[model samples]
Target chain A: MSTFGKLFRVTTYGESHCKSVGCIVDGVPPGMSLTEADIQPQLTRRRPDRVEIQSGTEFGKTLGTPIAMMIKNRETIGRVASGAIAEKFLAQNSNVEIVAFVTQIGEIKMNRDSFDPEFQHLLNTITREKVDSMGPIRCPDASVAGLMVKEIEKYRGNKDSIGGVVTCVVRNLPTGLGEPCFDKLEAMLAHAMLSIPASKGFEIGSGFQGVSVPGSKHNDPFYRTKTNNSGGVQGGISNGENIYFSVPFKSVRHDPAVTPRAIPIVEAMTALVLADALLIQKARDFS
Target chain B: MSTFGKLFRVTTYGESHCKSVGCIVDGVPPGMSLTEADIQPQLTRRRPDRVEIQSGTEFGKTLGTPIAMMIKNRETIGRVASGAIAEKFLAQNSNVEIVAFVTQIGEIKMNRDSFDPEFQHLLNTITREKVDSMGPIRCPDASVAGLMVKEIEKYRGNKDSIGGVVTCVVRNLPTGLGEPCFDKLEAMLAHAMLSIPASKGFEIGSGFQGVSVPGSKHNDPFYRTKTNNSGGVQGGISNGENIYFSVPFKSVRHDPAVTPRAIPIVEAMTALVLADALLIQKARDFS
Candidate 1:
């Protein structure tokens, strides 16, 4: 249970207030030039710029279990390194894009009415500058960012924390990216999201709301309109649409300030799931 | 992700209409009286009362991968065989007991007010006669048994499907049966339950309803009360209370009749998780 996914397996260990925390990440593609430097960037994305990167590799090349890291930080740091490794590996192998951002903070939320499908264009050319410039809440929509921060302030003022949601989208994921039945993409994402600390609920595509609508009205017709109520997945397989899902997180131990801190955690888990899914898809492709 | 658990790993494959469905169950304690007959009863727990059993060893013993079964059956049968092997292994080694029964089917649900904690006695002395006599839902409670059947008939009458919940309780599970943080026993259980086909929601302890109650009222005091809102787990570790959770299933693909079928699936999964947890606990005990 400390570990997740297949192919790109991530095993997390250590406790909240333990002296140290780390993870044994297995199944990164062999023959990659991996070093502590490559992992440092994402680790810095989460917290302090300092982390002790340990590896089972030799001469900057992944030899066996790929990468290992011990962070003088919380459990979240281990996952950040895992994400960096997966992102680096995928960058060298195939074209897969992953972007996760805050869509809601407490009551203030992103308005889907003005969502731009062409927003993906930014992903292809995404730079650290753009990501870091998205303000603390990390909502890509500039106008909504201020509201999210204010909402966090309201909760902080009351000494009570409020919950928020995160939405992640993966593009250019090949069709047939998920296993049917148990390991469907949606199910995998749900498991990954719920596994995160303080996560309260998860919904992919229509989710809970879909239950209320009739099947005929709820069903996304085949390509008549590009409306992706299926959230870019159907029958647990990627339909090549933009895959998306929302995760609601409980207030972090009553500290409303930490709501925005989930950004890196969400990205890391998403990368881990996609990394495993991609490897599985490749195995099936060649098999 | 079809694979689960850290020590006792189970990887399932195949689909309902596929030519064959099976799983490669790894990490079982080597050497056990394993044969087709040992697995037949659980396979019979489902319809058809027929299944083809295969093993990785000769002479009715498990040697390497422990057990591998390619059932010409649905996804559920593969898990059932995996459970059978784990049960056989645990029977010879420990006193772990697993019992799963239908608590709800569509509108009809069980009344927890009358639950008997000592019901585990029947599990310790379970026999084929007692199992068959428990009727279709396999509920040990005599009063609710007939209601479950009537509820099933109600769904079958409409030629439409309905879903129900299965409550699994693990008795005699040693206190240290879970891993903290990510792989908590309850989190693992929640993942397993949601992974099942048609599962809509999962709630451990007080679950969703517990949210509305304040922490003053919601928090289970330290052993003073028998009320187990924590669902036998706290801080992701089993508090040695009766670990219980509820899973709601959607009406089976428009035909609610198959809701009862999930009982074995639930039990099999529970067995798989426990078997893995027990092995993991043993590894930690020595290290």
Candidate 2:
């Protein structure tokens, strides 16, 4: 709530079940002939009701105010406060996917005594998000985006959520767009992503994949290719290569369900992350 | 202050005679390291002291704030605020150059008994700064890094001021960073630039210059060129082309021959602009 990004930032107010739920975007450019049409689709896509899961209202056209985007959450369901969550099976280091599941399932049912405790914990501990072709679940998008969606859903359900990755590469990024130190590119992204609804972990580039390979095989050599494979970014700024990254999800809360009065807690975190990302983008403009 | 962009933005804040100045960058990638040294030099270069002929400061460093910067004033000489200025200049604008000329000629010791009505309207006519060259006036390197300088010695002696301009360009940006429409690239840049200190105008790439050429000559045909004259950006996002813009300057107030007490004003503006740019960079990351 006390944060504002340079280019993209929104001050969110009201709880999920409050009189209204909305955000104010402070850094949108002027005179691009854009209206609510531009933002409506994304909100619509995020609606749980489209999947017949909840009753969240369809996203309407935006009014283009620098202050707020009014979103009507048609799915009244119930609210579940995080404080009331029963943490019997939660470990100190449990991932975010598990946390999301607890929040979603516990809150939607309107009651805390919905299912067995031991079974829920076991499911979280052993049930990996289907990453490979052989698993029951798999990341659908480039990685981060898909993972974020999955995690949100997982937390909404009586179980945990996980996985979303975004593949991005900045091309011809003017040098000197990023400062060196606490504001590094990777650091900012990590902070924002981890701050999402149920994001537990994150990685950039080949990440662990290239850790043990020989220098020639692991390194994206300096040679200029017709198209950059280094992900359009290097050393924290765009290197005119494609930069790729992924987010790992975990449970929103611990084992067992809580009542539905706390869903706002989970969504608030997600909104905060996006707000921070907006701030980071502001810094990047001058770096 | 009420607008934002989709690209990088850095907001600076300070006054003509503040102790120091500072800024905030938002869209930095996480994990990257950033320190004062990364920006100190740039700050020094934009300091006004190096261009003493115009308005300059003797202040060093700045108040350490993530979102603020200030510089102390060093000189005070003008007395236009008092009625004595009217007696001294019976019928002339209080431009420093004219005042210095009159003073050097030993004509400043005039009595207030005389009243001249012709000069009253002069103040209204000469209210802002004008460009002598396409860019800002050249000054010490410490006063011009990442910025432009204005030499106002001509208006300094008189109790008046003038302005100048600064230019910047971002290059090689990845496509898909902008959300398009209201968030278009040009709109964002204009918003950020207009928010800077004393900025009276904003423009993108040869702006009006494009109108001078015919369709065949004016259009920047799409091609894989080693460099893009489109200022390193095309459409509303960085197309790996240069993103260039200019800032207008209004002469600052400082007098070395009189009492010193400069209040806060323009410096506060720059800080805000930089802060806005950083946020824009973050939103662009989504695409």
Candidate 3:
């Protein structure tokens, strides 16, 4: 769908077992100090085995301008593309890189009909999502770890799949970016998060937890010292102390795990969010 | 190109003659009241004039829940299409949408003998762009009223083009969005604004104007009573004030003036900004 920012758009492509998974961040200023090094650390958090036990090789350090990144896929399993899909694309002749492993930690997969279908359905259908991370460090892999590579192999072997969460967050995000009514922040992230291969649920700062608690407990108390909820964001934006949420990784039904070779999509969403945040900043800049 | 708001995230597409010019506003909340009436005003502002000077065919109304707006084209222009050697594209796509307009607006064909070559070369640079608007009332259809449209058509006939500004303002916005440093509000907006059709330059606040004045005068004087400069966006987030900006549209050369048709692009930048803002709001919804 809309992977890029309306202002600072960033469109991401690639699946778990595709040639590559990458993104192009458009609208970046020409002189800004941008580099893969700057973004890689964040991506690393989302990698497998990086934080939790996910899969894939780690990223490197080399800051470059106009950051156009592509984490090579070291682990792949599927082969389901076509010549027709190529003809429809604008850059058909461009080099198609290979993918390795990223991670599939946040993803979950169950087999043997082991887990009660009722419980799984209940978790997916009735149970509410919680803003789980206590802080960004806990959710470091949100956009860091990425789509784990090895995990997909396991799922592919079993003709099954897995799913997990990617906690995405932005630091030093300026304020006054979103519009009221229809274009709320959570909704956009939800849309982006849901667009992934098999993303079933989405949440943001305080998300569902805030929904259940009383006003006093759920309320992100404000103060001059600093709004604990990360100021609604860190550096800026909605730090509410920190805008932390989690996405559930559903079980794979096709292969062993059935975790479709989904890319670590949280980064794409983060990029989109950043792009939109950048646009808001532009509006404020003129003001 | 802009990922403006903290919570809002809008992605726009289409052209004048394209299938549709619409925006995917991803961040709208579920319970907020909205309708086509909310969107109609903005569309009307962006619509091209029919016969009435500074007027256009009026739209009946719009449905407000994440709309996809497309403007239909009624004719064909040869000269504009001939240069690209796309007689077929012209037949298939009669109207120039946002993408085409950006190209027409940014590219310039200068008269070697009439003006300074260097000045002419730099003349068609776009300095700013804004996508966020307050309902339809705030969306400026200067593209229709702007003489630049005629200039582009003139140039298009002559195999040339130009660019100009499109400013947006979100008044009465609540505060607390954006971040600091690299993700600063201005930094993000500047990045995104430069991405729209033919953007060559970008700035916010006083813009390059700051270069001519001293810091004392350049600085937005912060006052207790309605800090006029719109502290609403101070520190990169909305402090609950009016958001205003002026973007420069680059001028280009074309076939003096023929029946130039305006591009029908889905300028979803505003919606994206609002969406990002909504995201930030959702993050801090409890705050």
TM-score, every prediction: 0.68, 0.37, 0.35
The DockQ-based CAPRI class assigned to model 3 is incorrect
Question: Which parts of model 1 are misplaced by more than 4 Å?
Answer: A1-74, A88-167, A179-191, A199-236, A246-259, B1-48, B52-74, B87-169, B180-182, B200-230, B246-253
Q: Score chain B of each candidate by TM-score.
A: 0.83, 0.46, 0.49
Q: Let me know the DockQ for model 1.
A: 0.13
Write candidate 3's Cα lDDT for A165-263 as tens digits: 444433333455444455556556566667655567776554554465455543433322212332143233332222334465565435322222233
State each model's CA lDDT, in order: 0.65, 0.32, 0.35
Provide C-alpha RMSD values for all models, in order.
6.9, 17.7, 19.3
Q: Residue A202: error of model 3 in Å? A: 19
Q: Best-fitting candidate, measured by lDDT?
A: 1
Q: What is the TM-score of chain A alone in each candidate?
A: 0.86, 0.49, 0.49
TM-score of chain B of 2: 0.46
Q: What's the best-to-worst order under TM-score?
A: 1, 2, 3
i-RMSD of model 2 (Å, 1 decimal): 13.6
Q: Which ten contiguous residues of candidate 2 chain B have the minimum total lDDT?
A: B97-106
State the number of backbone clashes in model 1.
Answer: 3
